């Protein structure tokens, strides 16, 4: 629902990355649907699953970038690390009962992804596909 992956918009020419992006999009979509309900326990389970996967995806990209000497690795990692800090803060507040997760939360994640993948991830394609 919320997100649709296509190669034209988001293809990196890096198979593992494209596959992990498609999983992220599916997990955002699930959270997005659940976030229109009051099922707070289900929201939390899906939130935590999504964030765990996103962090793992970032680690996967970072390991490959740094092992190959990719030119823009440190700046790219910095973008990841700011998102992880926002996500961790959201988890802390959500799991304390101090903030809610709603469809603005999933639209923010969508916004971040739809900018980051074409403008930041695509740039590693020549290096990581070589
Ligand atoms: Fe990515
Ligand atoms: Fe990335």
- Where do the structural domains in the chain lie, given as residue ranges? 1-130
What is the Cα–Cα distance from 73 to 113, expressed in whole angstroms? 18
Question: Relative to the alpha carbon of 123, which ligand is closest?
Answer: 2
Asked whether residue 42 is marked as a ligand-binding residue, the answer is no
Asked whether residue 9 is marked as a ligand-binding residue, the answer is no
How was this entry determined?
Answer: X-ray
- Residue-wise burial string across 10-19, b where 16 or more C-beta atoms lie within 10 A, e elsewhere: bbbebeebbe
Asked whether residue 61 is marked as a ligand-binding residue, the answer is yes
Asked whether residue 32 is marked as a ligand-binding residue, the answer is no
Q: At what angle do helices 40-67 and 15-34 cross, to 10 degrees?
A: 160
Three-class secondary structure assignment of the chain: CCCCCCHHHHCCCCHHHHHHHHHHHHHHHHHHHHCCCCCHHHHHHHHHHHHHHHHHHHHHHHHHHHHCCCCCHHHHHHHHHHHHHHHHHHHHHHHCCCCCCCHHHHHHHHHHHHHHHHHHHHHHHHHHHC
Q: What is the resolution of this structure in A?
A: 1.0
If you measure from the C-alpha of residue 47 to the centroid of ligand 2, how many angstroms do you get, rounded to a whole number?
A: 19
If you measure from the C-alpha of residue 42 to the centroid of ligand 2, how many angstroms do you get, rounded to a whole number?
A: 27
What is the Cα–Cα distance from 105 to 46, expressed in whole angstroms? 13
Asked whether residue 121 is marked as a ligand-binding residue, the answer is yes
What is the Cα–Cα distance from 37 to 60, expressed in whole angstroms? 33
If you measure from the C-alpha of residue 58 to the centroid of ligand 1, how many angstroms do you get, rounded to a whole number?
A: 6
Domain 1-130 CATH class label: mainly alpha
């Amino acid at each position: 629902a919320l997100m649709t992956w296509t190669a034209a918009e988001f293809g990196t020419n890096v198979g593992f990355a494209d596959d992990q992006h498609k999983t992220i999009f599916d997990m955002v979509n699930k959270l997005h649907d659940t976030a229109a309900t009051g099922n707070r326990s289900e929201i939390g389970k899906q939130l935590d699953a999504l964030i765990d996967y996103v962090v793992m995806h970032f680690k996967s990209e970072e390991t490959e970038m740094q092992k190959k000497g990719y030119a823009d690795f440190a700046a790219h990692k910095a973008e990841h690390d700011k998102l992880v800090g926002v996500c961790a803060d959201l988890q802390k507040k959500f799991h304390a009962g101090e903030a809610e997760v709603n469809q603005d939360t999933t639209r923010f994640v969508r916004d971040w992804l739809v900018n980051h993948i074409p403008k930041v991830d695509k740039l590693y394609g020549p290096c990581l596909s070589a």
